[PDB]
Design a protein around this ligand. Structure first.
Ligand SMILES: [Zn+2]
Lengths: 77, 64, 53, 99
RNA sequence: GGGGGGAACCUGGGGAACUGAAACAUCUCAGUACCCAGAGGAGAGGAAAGAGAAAUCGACUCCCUGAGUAGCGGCGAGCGA
RNA sequence: UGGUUCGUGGAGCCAUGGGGGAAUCUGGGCGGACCACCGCCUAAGGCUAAGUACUCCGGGUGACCGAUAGCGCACCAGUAC
RNA sequence: GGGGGUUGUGGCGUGCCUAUUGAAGCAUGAGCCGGCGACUCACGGUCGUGGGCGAGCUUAAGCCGUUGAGGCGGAGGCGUAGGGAAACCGAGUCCGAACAGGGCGCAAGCGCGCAAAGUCCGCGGCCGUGGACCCGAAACCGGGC
RNA sequence: GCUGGGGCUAGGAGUGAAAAGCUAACCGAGCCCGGAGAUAGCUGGUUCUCCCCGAAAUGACUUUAGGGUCAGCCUCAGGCG
RNA sequence: GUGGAGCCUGGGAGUGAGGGCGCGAGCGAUAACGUCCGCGUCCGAGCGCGGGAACAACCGAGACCGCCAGCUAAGGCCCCC
RNA sequence: GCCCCAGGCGGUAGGGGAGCGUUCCCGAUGCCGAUGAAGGCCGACCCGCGAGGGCGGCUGGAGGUAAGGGAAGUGC
RNA sequence: UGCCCGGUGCCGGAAGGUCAAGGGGAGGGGUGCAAGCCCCGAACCGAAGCCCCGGUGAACGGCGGCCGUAACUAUAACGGUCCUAAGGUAGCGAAAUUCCUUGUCGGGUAAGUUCCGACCUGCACGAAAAGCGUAACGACCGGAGCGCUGUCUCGGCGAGGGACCCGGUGAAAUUGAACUGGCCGUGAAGAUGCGGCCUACCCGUGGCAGGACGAAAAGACCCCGUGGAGCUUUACUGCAGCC
RNA sequence: UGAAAUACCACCCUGGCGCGGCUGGGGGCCUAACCCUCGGAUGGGGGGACAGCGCUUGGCGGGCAGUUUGACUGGGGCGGUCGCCUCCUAAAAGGUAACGGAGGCGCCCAAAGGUCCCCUCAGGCGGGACGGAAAUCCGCCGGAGAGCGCAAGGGUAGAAGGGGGCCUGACUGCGAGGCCUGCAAGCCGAGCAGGGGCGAAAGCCGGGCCUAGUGAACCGGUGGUCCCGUGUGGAAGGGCCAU
């Protein structure tokens, strides 16, 4: 008896890193995601790999706009 | 018999003033046609090793 | 990488220093690539000839 | 040791000249010093006196470094920081380079 | 005049491996163990075709320091003036 | 090829197994490839105390042992066996 | 002279050591007694600490002395400036075009003392080289029998 | 053929009508001494008392899987609060 | 929320063979005192104590010591008891 | 403020702290010792939590060694 | 003592390819003011060895597969095809080799997985690691038969030497201590030692060996150790040796 | 006169020729050396600088030596796997094992990159010469079920999808900050400066819709560097940058 299966890639540690109502400095990774489960918004940047991060400082503000996808905002202090 | 400094470490690391441990960022000796200018760039600078590893290395360089 | 997709440098046509390394599919592009790249030595954009890596 | 794997000291890259046979090349060494330490003296100060001062180690040529409050002194060093000449010449002290 | 002996101590010829490298061949162990020859109360070395950077020293031997430094090294282990 | 830190390295220096193979100071060797310059020294003969190593041995001393220790052996021990 | 010895009865109660998830274990060791028997030393490093001195600290070899007496000895080492591959510069240095930006740095206390950088030494922990806690191989090699 | 006496061949060597036998009662490489206190990531053992605290048996990587380096978890000293 | 709480800085560790039970899963045969994981607990190290007859992890409960005192836990209250 | 207050005190690996004892150095040209050392046997006696220490009795016949420190071939 | 020289080994080969040291020095470089000095160095010449060409089996060794096919069936003398260097010849063949298998048949036996003779469908015989046969020989291994038997049915007695008793001398292995019972359970899963029962007056002597995971030998079988050792080779490297 | 003008006279090259020298290779011969043999040995004989013996060249070389010959593992072996991506396992944070359940990667694109501008799919129906089930065309219905280079997933048309314009930012020096993490690695990146691309600008552009397409250090090569250059200047050689 042999096996074709048995291999699995490494855990990537995706997900949201800072939550709403949480102070962040600019440059902090907000969401480490594949594709855009959250879209960048107010004061929120997104690198080449869809990584959302703080553009300016302040507080994180998640906001779902229904059909318009889930956005993130960095509301300044 | 006095200790002997680990010359293999002497050729890789410098110990700063604050007891930190410094050596060049690895991974840019070759295979670079596809690496990013960010990659070669930031790998082009020194850095401070992790705390414990740096400590051991300090043990290796007694007369430094 | 492949024997058909080779590596290559990009010498500056003027400072003559290989400032960039990239690759091509020599099958598709049998011509020496040439691209205006910023020559840091010349400190200005300049046509770079594809030089054999 | 790391249980047989490549040690972290060895995964790192060699950097810089490591010298080769017949080895290192004797050239003049400059044990740089600071004006703030020279303040303990009076008038003129020499390399030898600094040696007796426990400051200028033997076999070293003394440079001055622009630290501390200058003093209107006639110091005779093998070299100076430019700041050393600035403070010293400005503080009335006499920067006297010798050879 | 020699022969042979003499505990250790010295050269001079020969000269290991175990062991370390967490394997192992380069390497290290070590020119060590040991063998042989020779002496002597010592031996060796010893009066620069030297050192090596100062126009500097000035046969040789040994102690400390230089210095674990310069360096050598599957640039590893280590060795190391 | 060996020694030198020198594991062939840019490999000098000392030595020498082969093969070539000098000259006598304007001759030579060396300062780490090599070239020029600048300097050091005079190879291919020999000898040389001292200061150093050791303890067969005599003596002195021990935060040395005290007969299961101390030397294998305090005694008729390198013995009986 | 209140204790001491024995235990008849009743209750309770699975030797010790190691090694183990797990031993009363039918796993290991020990017949018992007596004696020997195993974490040290040196030299380096590092941490702490008791003291000395302190931008100083401090000697080695040796010398001189006594013959249990210490002193001399500053050669030398550590520290006082870092950064850089290095030349080199210098509280800056490196990368860099940059004065950009970053990396490694620099800023010591209190009220003349208190302190204290550091450094010497003792002590102790740990580490490195040494046989390195003690015993144990099978083995290898040299010289001989 | 067997046997006595006299001798020769020995250690990676001898001898062997050959079994890998024998080579001084254990020979797939003799014995003694020496290297040597080889190495042993393995086994066993590791000795007076009292007190405080108090684990792990996980991750990563490993010629690594019964061993190790880092982190996890313990303790101690100091500091912060 | 003042706790053998927490953090930081240093020294020293051991540990890196775990196991049972519950729950959620994989594998297995919806077998295993099976194996492999996650959460938790206990043992380990608590084979100290009561019950479960006996029994490491099931129930109770954390053993500084003494007392010929009292109240309860699980569990029992017909005799052993 | 030596005593009281509160809390804590199962424990392997392991970390830390605190003591006991053995040989030897200083104390010591000292002190104890033939009226008996060390050592041995014994104690139901006293001290300590313990490691142990005294003290006593008999044997023993000649060394032992304090407080307070130091150093280990130190505890089976 | 058949075939295969395809690969390996060997023997032979002046063609040819390759091929080191060496030679050679186009050229190139450092240095010097130059002389000069120093160093790289291509072409080409340049050995075995190797490749290459041959031969070589009592040299290493190797010696096929599928499909169809004849007067019932069956089979296949026969043909087709693919591959190989070649397709195993003589001879033997369920064998010291036959897995299926105690094959089938015959003998032998009342009954024979063994023996013997054939069968061949030889998993996987086979020709100098020789094939087949073979008289004599064998402390060789099989099978069968006769004789004789205490081997046995199935045992019995007897004799001697011990064992037993006495007097003398008098060990050893081993041993945690022992005040050491059975069952049913539990317990690291097989209990004198734990629990419930039951049973048992103290101690002996001669015996049997069920247990005390009895003793003996730090399991040799298994695994592990980055343990060793011996041996092999077209493992690596090196060396003797040889060219 | 030719692209050159002539005799004659030189530097010379052109290949050949032969004379010599310095040569090298092969032959053939000889004899003292060297090697036997001659009882004679300051001599015979024989072979013959073709041997032997040095140094180095290369080669063959289990004759010999030193050695290697992995791990995981429901014992080991045999088989399988070893690295990274995707999904479940995985218990609604992340991480999470099994020789658990499924597939991938070891690249590719000079455009499949940047930017501006333009468009929106699959599919279904009806009509439509070849011509169809399915070519191209038309209308109608469609939120995405299409496509997005390739595994899966996530994402996505208010584009990341298709087309065109230009362009090369598939930038240099950097980098606030973070995620992830034992470490090392890995990942995101504002912003700044140099100098550019597209665009009116706003703006974006430090490769690719993303998650795989890869490998530490050492050793060395190549180019720049001009940093060190062993008494000095050079150089050898290194360092550093790129690779
Ligand atoms: Zn340029």
């Amino acid at each position: 008896g042999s096996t074709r299966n048995g291999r699995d890639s490494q855990a990537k540690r995706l997900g949201v890193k800072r939550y709403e109502g949480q102070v962040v400095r600019a440059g902090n990774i907000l969401v480490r995601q594949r594709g855009t489960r959250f879209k960048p918004g107010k004061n929120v940047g997104m690198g080449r790999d869809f990584t959302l991060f703080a553009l300016v400082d302040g507080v994180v503000e998640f906001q779902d706009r229904g059909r318009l996808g889930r956005y993130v905002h960095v509301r300044p202090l | 018999p006095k200790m002997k400094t680990h010359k293999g470490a002497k050729k890789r690391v410098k110990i700063t003033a604050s007891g930190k441990v410094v050596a060049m960022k690895t991974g840019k000796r070759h295979l670079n046609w596809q690496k990013s200018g960010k990659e070669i760039r930031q790998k082009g600078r020194k850095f401070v090793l992790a705390k414990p590893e740096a400590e051991r290395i300090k043990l290796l360089l007694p007369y430094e | 990488a492949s024997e058909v997709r080779i590596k290559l440098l990009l010498e500056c046509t003027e400072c003559k220093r290989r400032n960039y390394a990239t690759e091509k599919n020599k099958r598709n592009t049998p011509n020496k690539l040439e691209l205006r790249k910023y020559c840091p030595w010349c400190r200005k954009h300049t046509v770079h000839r594809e030089v054999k890596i | 040791f790391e249980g047989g794997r490549s040690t972290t000291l060895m995964r790192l890259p060699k950097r810089g000249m490591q010298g080769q046979v017949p080895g290192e090349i004797k050239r003049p060494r400059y044990q740089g010093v600071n004006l703030k330490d020279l303040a303990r003296f009076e008038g003129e100060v020499t390399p030898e006196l600094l040696v007796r001062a426990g400051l200028l180690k033997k076999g070293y040529r003394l440079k001055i470094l622009g630290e501390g409050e200058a003093k209107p002194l006639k110091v005779v060093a093998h070299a100076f920081s430019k700041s050393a000449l600035e403070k010293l010449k400005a503080a009335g002290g006499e920067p006297v380079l010798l050879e």
